[PDB]
Amino acid sequence: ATSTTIAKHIGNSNPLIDHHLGADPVALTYNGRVYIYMSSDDYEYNSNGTIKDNSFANLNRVFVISSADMVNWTDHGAIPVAGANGANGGRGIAKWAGASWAPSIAVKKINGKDKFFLYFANSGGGIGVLTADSPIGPWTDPIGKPLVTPSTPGMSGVVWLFDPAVFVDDDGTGYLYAGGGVPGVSNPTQGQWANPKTARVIKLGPDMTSVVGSASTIDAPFMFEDSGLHKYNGTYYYSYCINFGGTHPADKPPGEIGYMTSSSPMGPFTYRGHFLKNPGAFFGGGGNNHHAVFNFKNEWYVVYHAQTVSSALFGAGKGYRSPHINKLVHNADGSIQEVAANYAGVTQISNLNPYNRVEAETFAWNGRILTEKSTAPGGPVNNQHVTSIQNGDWIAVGNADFGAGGARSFKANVASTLGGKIEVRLDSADGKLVGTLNVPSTGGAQTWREIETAVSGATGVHKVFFVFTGTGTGNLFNFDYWQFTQR
Numbered sequence: 001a002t003s004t005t006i007a008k009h010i011g012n013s014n015p016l017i018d019h020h021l022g023a024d025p026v027a028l029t030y031n032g033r034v035y036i037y038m039s040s041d042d043y044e045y046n047s048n049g050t051i052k053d054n055s056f057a058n059l060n061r062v063f064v065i066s067s068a069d070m071v072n073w074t075d076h077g078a079i080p081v082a083g084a085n086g087a088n089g090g091r092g093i094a095k096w097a098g099a100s101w102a103p104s105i106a107v108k109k110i111n112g113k114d115k116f117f118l119y120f121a122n123s124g125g126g127i128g129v130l131t132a133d134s135p136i137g138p139w140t141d142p143i144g145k146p147l148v149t150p151s152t153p154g155m156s157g158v159v160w161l162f163d164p165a166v167f168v169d170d171d172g173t174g175y176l177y178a179g180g181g182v183p184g185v186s187n188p189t190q191g192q193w194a195n196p197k198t199a200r201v202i203k204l205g206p207d208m209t210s211v212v213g214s215a216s217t218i219d220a221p222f223m224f225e226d227s228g229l230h231k232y233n234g235t236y237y238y239s240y241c242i243n244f245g246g247t248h249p250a251d252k253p254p255g256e257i258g259y260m261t262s263s264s265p266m267g268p269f270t271y272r273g274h275f276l277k278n279p280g281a282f283f284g285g286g287g288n289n290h291h292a293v294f295n296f297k298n299e300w301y302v303v304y305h306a307q308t309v310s311s312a313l314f315g316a317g318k319g320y321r322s323p324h325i326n327k328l329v330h331n332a333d334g335s336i337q338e339v340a341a342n343y344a345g346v347t348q349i350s351n352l353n354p355y356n357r358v359e360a361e362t363f364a365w366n367g368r369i370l371t372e373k374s375t376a377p378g379g380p381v382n383n384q385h386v387t388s389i390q391n392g393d394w395i396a397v398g399n400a401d402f403g404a405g406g407a408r409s410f411k412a413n414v415a416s417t418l419g420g421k422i423e424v425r426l427d428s429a430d431g432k433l434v435g436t437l438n439v440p441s442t443g444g445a446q447t448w449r450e451i452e453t454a455v456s457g458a459t460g461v462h463k464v465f466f467v468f469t470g471t472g473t474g475n476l477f478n479f480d481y482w483q484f485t486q487r
């Protein structure tokens with residue numbers, strides 16, 4: 001092993017991933033996993049091949065990852081949401097939409113079956129929705145038009161009609177929160193900064209793909225963007241990013257996440273405080289702040305973004321963002337403590353079972369590979385593989401539990417032109433070698449073979465490193481899934 005981690009270092013849980021970017025995260029908790037959906041941050045380039053600042057040009061997909069344990073993330077690839085203009089090579093799902101910013105996700109049981117709803121903003125001009133029968137698709141655009149526009153009753157007055165947050169209440173009623181921006185264009189007055197009156201909530205119809213009644217204004221002090229809703233001990237918490245302009249009081253610091261409470265999902269809301277500083281306060285610089293609060297496996301968390309991967313690569317964040325998660329703490333009086341945003345993140349919640357099929361694109365740390373949609377036969381919805389594998393690259397999972405009896409063999413589904421090796425090591429990239437899988441020539445990068453090799457000395461709980469070697473260039477092999485067998 002020679003390659004180094006970009007930003008998510010071994011033993012740390014933030015950023016969640018560093019093999020690509022992901023902005024504007026939101027969480028779905030479903031059947032023992034947390035799924036994180038993100039804006040598709042992706043580098044823009046000058047004609048000479050140098051990086052330029054993020055202008056959101058590439059925000060036409062939604063990236064999805066998931067975890068059972070907060071450390072190992074399965075990469076589920078990209079949903080080609082936007083279908084207008086150049087978007088997604090003709091494969092875009094929403095043909096009316098040129099962009100898919102800042103997703104929100106909801107699940108609702110309808111007629112005995114769980115149904116999934118992905119909301120997004122078509123830049124600052126409207127909100128769309130896609131539907132699916134699984135959290136990872138495939139996705140349908142049932143309307144063919146935005147769900148919410150400036151003509152939707154109650155939505156006049158919104159400056160940026162974006163950043164949706166959809167919440168399904170305990171009674172099954174969905175609510176859509178959206179909006180932001182500050183009125184007054186290039187020069188808002190102090191009062192316009194203080195009360196933009198651009199946040200909205202509208203009730204959804206039972207089917208989650210329509211609205212009922214009119215939107216209500218939420219008078220979030222110093223509103224900017226990034227609506228969020230969570231419910232704690234019977235109280236509704238509307239959270240949002242506080243704006244950056246005008247003078248601000250000590251209790252409404254610029255660019256931080258503010259929150260308000262109500263006994264009802266549509267208000268009236270009362271400002272309570274703020275609980276997440278700007279990512280720049282923790283990681284350097286500054287930029288936009290986007291978050292979602294959720295409860296997964298009986299703990300409260302917030303997912304947010306920071307420029308921690310781009311900064312590590314370039315020495316400047318340049319507006320390119322990555323997901324992070326940290327614990328969020330409610331006090332006895334219902335107030336929320338400041339979130340201690342950091343790199344350590346959340347300690348692994350549960351071990352990984354290495355005796356099931358585990359996708360190769362399910363990993364905790366890597367140095368340095370890519371993931372992409374796979375040609376491998378079978379596999380899960382939108383199955384990916386690990387690629388851009390060169391000599392000395394590696395991936396690792398956290399806390400695989402081999403059990404007392406341990407492992408007998410290791411299987412890997414691989415495709416390779418010239419061949420190579422996968423070393424299976426415990427604890428560290430140079431740790432105990434328990435097996436070496438010889439990747440043969442399979443006939444090419446799209447011709448797949450499941451290879452089996454011996455394993456010995458793999459018992460108990462360990463980080464597991466898969467270290468890639470070979471003499472060729474460039475791509476040694478593609479790697480789809482693996483599975484150990486029990487001794």
Ligand SMILES: O[C@@H]1[C@@H](O)[C@H](O[C@@H]2CO[C@@H](O[C@@H]3CO[C@@H](O)[C@H](O)[C@H]3O)[C@H](O)[C@H]2O)OC[C@H]1O
Nearest residue numbers: 123124125160162225244245255286287288289
């Ligand atoms: O076309 C519109 C976009 O331009 C608009 O982008 C917003 C631009 O401001 C961003 O917030 C900045 C974060 O960094 C701070 O230092 C700055 O003071 C902020 O202005 C915001 O996150 C973007 O959404 O979005 C709406 C589009 O219609």
Ligand SMILES: [Ca+2]
Nearest residue numbers: 359384385480
């Ligand atoms: Ca796979």
Ligand code: NA
Nearest residue numbers: 024026102103
């Ligand atoms: Na969001």
Ligand code: NA
Nearest residue numbers: 368369388390
């Ligand atoms: Na590589």
